[PDB]
Write a protein that binds this ligand. Structure first.
Ligand SMILES: [Zn+2]
Ligand SMILES: [Zn+2]
Ligand SMILES: [Zn+2]
Ligand SMILES: [Zn+2]
Lengths: 238, 138, 70, 103, 295, 211, 84, 173, 174
């Protein structure tokens, strides 16, 4: 008497929330390496596109992911294709390498580190993700509560260091954009607004991860007017 | 296999001594966890209706097994259909019923944060600020 | 307990009923005659189109009255 | 643990390293102590690894561990998997009272 | 048939303006009516913002709609449609796609009685429903309830449902929706108890496949796909992600069973050994049947 | 501490509010939650010191009874309980899957039901089963022996219905010799009431096969 | 005894990790704040419910609605809008 | 909506009652009290129908119609001014009291003559507190039948409070 | 401990009991249905019966019970035993009490099937009761036979028209 149903997605969700710029696989060429290529994801859906022909081409539309991808970034690490560092629901940092397997491109996982709990939730250190431009450390955060940093290493096998925490209990975070560095030390900037305050105060704050002592440091805290929006990094000035 | 054993759990959850009510809830944990999403869900409402009165029961062993039982039934019924029982005495005058229900609300909150969001009992006049954007329609 | 049973009784129902407040379960919290009165006080348009097409404001019963005069 | 109340777990951010169980505690979920259907590997925080203490079993923390410790399927469904580092710290009253009872 | 914020109004045409042919006040709980639909001028289904849906009847000579059924869970409805006389599909703000069925005990009363009897007059209800009215006036105030028929989590916000009697001459009537982010998807009813059993077993295979590869890997390292999320590429289980706000009930995902086609032959023949049933080729046949035949 | 009369005035369903709801820390909010749509009240055995079960109701409960489907499997005779088995595996496997596929308990419970101590379901199921079989116009042979009313004989109230008329709640009731033919009276029946596919119809029913 | 004394401890830990958890006595304000934060996080997190809010409010850009929701989590944000 | 039933065989079961009375009308509920001491019913019942009309019709049809175990079943259906008066004359009959107090107020019931200490006193029931105010105003400390009589309110300390005036005013209205 | 007595289960639907209270419920444990007490072992039961609360409940049940609950005539000649079995019982226990007669209406019988006539029942302690149907509304119902002497015995019927030859054991009634 019941009603049994069968679901199909005929045409996938089309609103692209994420992109990453790296060079992923070597296709149809014996040896070629060029940084022009891009991978684009919307929550569940994911795709790979190519360039350098002057006009963007579709390469591969990968298998159904069945999750909510909350950030996607290409990390490039010194000494090699690029693989995308991908955080999502399930609270798992998932470093994924798209590859050429059998007859068609496949989406292959390398390391997924457990974080928080499996859902979208405000404590979950996702929704803000960025990578040191030299590929030394992935860095994650959440609104309110915690911020994490994983120190990336590469060897015969990919290797992820244990996370580095900073816990600011009431500070809810926005616009995590990270400053590039010369190998000196990874540094990143946030606009943090306080959850419990009698007035509206959004202050920008700098963090410098000290590779020497292996912890993240609060360096400069500057209060700005409540209308603050976002942050970008200026590379050098020298 | 459920369907047969709910009248068996019927007598177990009813019985006087506190051991049957304990041990039977342990059946409800292993049954509700891996039978969730199968589409029965009309037997788990029955089982819950038998469990809820046991929340006030003391002793460590029965209370942890009962709580685990309610948590397993949360995934069989779903967060909201399970919450409809709790919101009532979640405040309450009695300092005890309150102390008892805030625990189940703690476990439910740990299992579900954004899963309970549509299900809060909040209207614009129920709380001061509410959220103006939940009332928008396009 | 005896007082909680006093709320459903012949006599108390005679006091509510003879006071003018219809006795029922909703009125069982309370002794005092004053507040029950405010409780009872808190307990207690169609456009039928005249042929001229100005009766678009004209109510049902009004258009029935003009059925009687018409 | 589940059966013994005086025990206190760690519950910190799980690191990249897997816990280990002694031959005696082998094949048990650190949470509910269920021998059946394992699911995932446990992971322990830095402050639970460091030196020799890393080699000990993560339940009894006395004997040396060998096999990786697994979360049972149910504790992964309930999500008690990802709470934190599931390493027992204190030894509990039972083991001590045994030790001094014998001699 | 228009919906004010609280109340439902029925307008007919007139000259110099249009006029109110009927007005019906809603029960206390309903605040706004976001979407609503009819069944062949006999019945209504009315959605809210916060609460779920309520089914009415057009009562002539009472010139009013009388609620005979309500829902047991708070659900925020974007859109709503009658699948049949007794059942309804709806969507949610939060990405849920659900289907409700009015219980049979109510349907016997609905077929065996006139609408005018419902509002006033006597339909003798079983004592149970009454005692539920006295015991729970806030819940059961509108008698009976819905029984949840299907529930499914598709992360979009479904804007429109479209029920079709046939898709490209196919036998099984489907229902194709379209979401906010843009999407199209189809719920096809499976007519058999056998095919839902095959598709069920295939969904169960593909569901924990990422767990099967992993436990196999460990077991073959003990005696002689490295990641735990190997075949899922991410961490979500199928039942958890597809459940979320509430457990899936009868809806079995065909977008998971459709990935089995894209696996390598070694992996397909590896997963298929879990069944005493038919081989891989027949699995691919069963999967590929729905797009060929059913639409 | 606002009086409950002042408190009941805020509530669309004021009949739930109780004298103790006056005394909550947040009575205005609690009165809004408790009367919100689907919330089911706290079980009522709080403020009782009896540990939620006192034997007075529990002394007379029946030990247990197997479902009729399982009792059909004959184990009741094989193993003696109150106060080598040789069972067919095909039979048992057919009982749970093929035979009992759709079998569900008679009662279960609805969403709003909560089980209070003195409640007993064994009576309520017998009351549903009672309303189902017992019908107007018919009388059981046992009750006919109690009334000394042989078959084919009109009941003793037939005359007062001749004077006063048919039952009010039974307009469609047909009684022999009055609104309905007297010869059709036979046996136990002296009167009788004489007034899809749901889009998912499975059209095939196949249980999982053992072999 | 010792079991309850573990219950208090796990209470303090989970209240730290997961932020809002009612204990026994929690003011209506303390709880309604948690409800507000959860709701806003759901509205911003899912790109669906963010599209819906952005189109409904008719704002010029998605990021304006998202930052509006984040800012709304601070109490002083209401008064800040009133001073404009 | 509930009717009383009596002269029931203790051997009768709720099943048999329901089967009997459903012939007459739909029966909402049957409360058929049992002694929980002896598990033996007391031979009476309360049958609650859905409306009043069914109850009345059932009373009319089923009363003394049917014999259950030879036993013929039975079916059946189911605050004012007061004045104390002291030092009355022994020549005053209750009817003379009636004629005295009628002009002041309409008597809901008859007066009650009782002897205290020897001392003839009475209670007089009026339908109105104001009519009783007239009776006290004129009759208090007045000589009738060559005996001085005193008229006041009867104790419950006596009637005539403010709440008494209010709720008596309502019961009248 | 139990003195070898079988204590039946609560559900067995009643061999006379010693104390008609202590049972075994559907479970194993022992119960006292008055006091609603659960006892683990028979010794605890014997302590319950020897306890003070059970006595109070027995008395309260006692009060609870004690508050509720020229013409034609016929002549009968009933004969009794010839010192055959009455040789074992002679302890002046109502032995001086003669047989008694009463007129009973058939409206009440163990079977309750047919009725509508009276019976002239005659009873004696050991022997079984005896009845005689009286269709005639009235026979031999006299009018002040003796001169109003008041030793009611049992009733006007017995003194008025009965004789008990106790020496020969012959009861005459007319
Ligand atoms: Zn640790
Ligand atoms: Zn160990
Ligand atoms: Zn476990
Ligand atoms: Zn006793």
């Amino acid at each position: 008497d019941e009603l049994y149903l069968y679901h199909l997605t005929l045409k996938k969700q089309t609103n692209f929330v994420h992109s990453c710029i790296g060079h992923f696989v070597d296709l149809e060429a014996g040896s070629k390496r060029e940084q022009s290529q891009l991978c684009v994801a919307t929550e569940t859906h994911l795709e790979l596109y190519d360039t350098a022909d002057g006009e963007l081409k579709l390469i591969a539309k990968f298998q159904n992911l069945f999750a909510t991808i909350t950030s996607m970034k290409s990390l490039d690490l010194p000494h090699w294709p690029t693989f995308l560092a991908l955080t999502s629901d399930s609270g798992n940092l998932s470093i994924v390498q798209i590859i050429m397997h059998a007859g068609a491109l496949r989406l292959k996982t390398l390391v997924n580190q457990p974080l928080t709990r499996t859902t979208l939730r405000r404590v979950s250190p996702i929704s803000y993700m960025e990578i040191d431009p030299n590929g030394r450390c992935i860095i994650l955060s959440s609104v309110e509560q915690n911020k994490l940093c994983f120190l990336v290493d590469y060897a015969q096998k990919l290797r992820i260091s244990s996370p580095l925490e900073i816990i600011r209990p009431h500070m809810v975070t926005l616009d995590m954009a990270v400053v590039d560095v010369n190998f000196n030390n990874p540094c990143f900037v946030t606009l943090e607004i306080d959850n419990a305050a009698t007035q509206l105060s959004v202050h920008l704050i700098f963090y410098v991860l000290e590779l020497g002592l292996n912890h993240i440091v609060k360096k400069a805290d500057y209060l700005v007017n409540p209308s603050a929006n976002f942050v970008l990094s200026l590379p050098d000035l020298s | 296999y459920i369907y047969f054993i709910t009248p068996l759990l019927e007598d177990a959850l009813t019985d006087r001594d506190l051991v049957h009510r304990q041990t039977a809830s342990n059946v409800i944990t292993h049954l509700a966890l891996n039978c969730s999403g199968t589409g029965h869900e009309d037997a788990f409402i029955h089982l819950m209706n038998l469990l809820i009165p046991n929340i006030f029961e003391t002793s460590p062993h029965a209370i942890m097994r009962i709580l685990e039982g309610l948590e397993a039934l949360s995934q069989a019924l779903g967060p909201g259909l399970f919450m409809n029982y709790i919101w009532a005495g979640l405040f309450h005058p009695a300092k005890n019923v309150r102390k008892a229900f805030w625990r189940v609300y703690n476990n439910m909150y740990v299992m579900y944060q954004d899963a309970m969001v549509p299900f809060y009992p909040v209207t614009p006049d129920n709380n001061e600020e509410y959220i103006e954007e939940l009332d928008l329609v396009l | 307990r005896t007082f909680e049973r006093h709320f459903n009784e012949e006599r108390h129902i005679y006091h509510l009923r003879c006071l003018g407040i219809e006795p029922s379960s909703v009125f069982k919290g309370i002794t005092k005659i004053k507040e029950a009165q405010e409780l009872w006080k808190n307990m207690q348009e169609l456009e039928l189109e005249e042929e001229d097409e100005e009766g678009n404001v004209m109510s049902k019963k009004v258009y029935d009255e003009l059925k009687k005069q018409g | 643990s589940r059966h013994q109340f005086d025990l206190i777990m760690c519950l910190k951010q799980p690191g990249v390293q897997t816990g280990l169980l002694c031959e005696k505690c082998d094949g048990k979920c650190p949470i509910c102590d269920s021998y059946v259907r394992p699911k995932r590997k446990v992971r322990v925080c830095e402050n639970c690894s460091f030196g020799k203490q890393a080699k000990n079993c993560i339940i009894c923390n006395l004997n040396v561990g060998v096999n990786d410790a697994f979360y049972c399927w149910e504790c992964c469904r309930l999500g008690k998997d990802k709470d934190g580092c599931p390493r027992i710290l204190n030894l509990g009253s039972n083991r001590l009272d045994r030790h001094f009872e014998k001699k | 048939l228009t919906a004010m914020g609280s109340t439902i109004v029925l307008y007919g045409l007139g000259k110099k303006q249009l006029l109110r042919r009927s007005v019906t006040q809603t029960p206390v709980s309903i605040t706004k009516i976001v979407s609503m639909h009819q069944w062949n001028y006999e019945r209504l289904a009315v959605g809210d913002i916060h609460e779920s849906v309520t089914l009415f009847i057009w009562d002539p000579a009472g010139n009013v709609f009388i609620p005979y059924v309500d829902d047991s869970v708070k659900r925020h409805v974007t859109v709503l449609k009658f699948l049949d006389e007794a059942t309804v599909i709806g969507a949610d703000r939060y990405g849920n796609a659900w289907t409700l069925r009015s219980p049979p005990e109510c349907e016997k009363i609905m077929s065996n009685h006139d609408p005018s009897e419902l509002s006033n007059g006597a339909i003798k209800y079983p004592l149970d429903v009454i005692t539920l009215q006295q015991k729970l006036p806030n819940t059961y105030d509108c008698k009976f309830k819905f029984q949840l028929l299907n529930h499914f989590f598709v992360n979009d916000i479904i804007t429109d449902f479209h029920i079709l009697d046939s898709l490209s001459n196919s036998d099984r009537p489907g229902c194709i929706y379209m979401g906010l982010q843009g999407t199209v998807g189809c719920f096809i009813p499976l007519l058999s108890k056998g095919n839902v059993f095959m598709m069920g077993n295939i969904e169960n295979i593909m569901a924990e496949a990422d767990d099967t590869f992993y436990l196999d890997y460990e077991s073959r390292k003990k005696n002689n796909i490295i990641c735990e999320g190997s075949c899922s590429i991410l961490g979500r289980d199928h039942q958890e992600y597809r459940s979320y706000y509430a457990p899936v009930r009868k809806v079995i995902d065909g977008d998971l069973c459709e990935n089995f086609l894209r696996l390598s032959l070694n992996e397909q023949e590896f997963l298929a050994k879990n069944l005493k049933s038919v081989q891989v080729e027949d699995i691919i046949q069963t999967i590929n049947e729905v797009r060929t035949n059913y639409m | 501490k606002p009086s409950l009369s002042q408190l009941k005035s805020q509530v669309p369903y004021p009949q739930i509010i109780e004298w103790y709801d006056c005394d909550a820390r947040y009575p205005g909010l609690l009165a809004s939650i408790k009367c919100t749509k689907n919330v089911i009240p706290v079980p009522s055995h709080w403020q009782s010191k009896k540990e939620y079960l006192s034997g007075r109701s529990l002394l007379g409960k029946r030990p247990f009874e197997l479902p009729d489907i399982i009792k059909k499997t004959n184990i009741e005779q094989m193993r003696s309980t109150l106060p080598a088995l040789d069972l067919d595996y095909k039979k048992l496997h057919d009982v749970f899957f093929k035979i009992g596929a759709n079998w569900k308990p008679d009662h279960l419970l609805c969403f709003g039901d909560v089980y209070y101590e003195n409640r007993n379901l064994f009576e309520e199921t017998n009351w549903k089963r009672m309303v189902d079989h017992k019908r107007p116009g018919r009388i059981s042979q046992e009750l006919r022996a109690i009334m000394n009313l042989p078959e084919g004989q009109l009941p003793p109230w037939c005359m007062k219905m001749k004077d006063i008329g048919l039952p009010t709640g039974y307009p469609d009731l047909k009684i022999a010799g009055l609104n309905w033919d007297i010869t059709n009276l036979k046996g136990d029946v002296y009167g009788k009431i004489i007034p899809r596919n749901y889009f998912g119809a499975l059209i095939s029913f196949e249980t999982p096969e053992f072999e | 005894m010792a079991e309850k004394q573990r219950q208090l401890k796990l209470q303090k830990i989970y209240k730290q990790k997961y932020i809002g958890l009612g204990d026994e006595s929690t003011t209506r304000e303390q709880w309604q704040r948690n409800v507000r934060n959860d709701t806003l996080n759901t509205l911003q997190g899912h790109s669906a419910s963010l599209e819906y809010v952005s189109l409904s409010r008719g704002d010029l850009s998605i990021r304006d609605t998202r930052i509006h929701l984040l800012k709304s989590m601070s109490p002083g944000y209401k008064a800040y809008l009133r001073e404009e | 909506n509930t009717v009383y039933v009596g002269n029931i065989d203790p051997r009768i079961t709720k099943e048999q009652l329901y089967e009997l009375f459903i012939q007459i009308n739909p029966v909402l509920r049957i409360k058929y009290p049992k002694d929980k001491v002896l598990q033996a019913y007391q031979g009476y019942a309360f049958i609650e129908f859905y409306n009043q009309g069914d109850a009345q019709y059932a009373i009319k049809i089923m009363n003394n119609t049917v014999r259950l175990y030879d036993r013929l079943i039975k079916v059946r259906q189911v605050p004012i001014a007061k004045l104390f008066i002291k030092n009355l004359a022994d020549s005053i009959d209750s009817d003379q009291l009636v004629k005295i107090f009628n002009k002041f107020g309409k008597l809901i019931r008859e007066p009650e003559i009782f002897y205290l200490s020897k001392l003839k006193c009475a209670y007089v029931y009026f339908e109105d507190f104001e009519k009783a105010d007239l009776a006290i105003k004129s009759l208090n400390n007045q000589l009738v039948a060559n005996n001085r009589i005193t008229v006041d309110y009867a104790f419950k300390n006596g009637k005539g409070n403010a709440k008494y005036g209010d709720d008596v005013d309502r019961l009248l209205n | 401990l139990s003195k070898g007595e079988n204590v039946p289960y609560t559900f067995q639907d009643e061999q006379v009991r010693s104390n008609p209270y202590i049972y075994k419920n559907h479970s194993g444990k022992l119960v006292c249905k008055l006091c609603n007490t659960m006892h683990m072992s028979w010794s605890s039961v014997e302590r319950h019966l020897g306890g003070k609360k059970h006595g109070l409940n027995v008395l309260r049940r006692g009060i609870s019970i004690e508050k509720s609950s020229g013409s034609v005539g016929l002549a009968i000649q009933v004969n009794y035993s010839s010192e055959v079995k009455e040789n074992s019982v002679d302890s002046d226990d109502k032995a001086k009490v003669p047989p008694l007669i009463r007129i009973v209406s058939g409206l009440e019988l163990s079977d309750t099937k047919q009725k509508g006539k009276k019976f002239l029942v005659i009873a004696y302690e050991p022997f079984e009761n005896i009845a005689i149907e009286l269709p005639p509304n009235e026979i031999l119902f006299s009018e002040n036979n003796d001169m109003d002497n008041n030793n009611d015995g049992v009733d006007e019927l017995n003194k008025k028209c009965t004789f008990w030859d106790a020496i020969s054991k012959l009861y005459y009634v007319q």
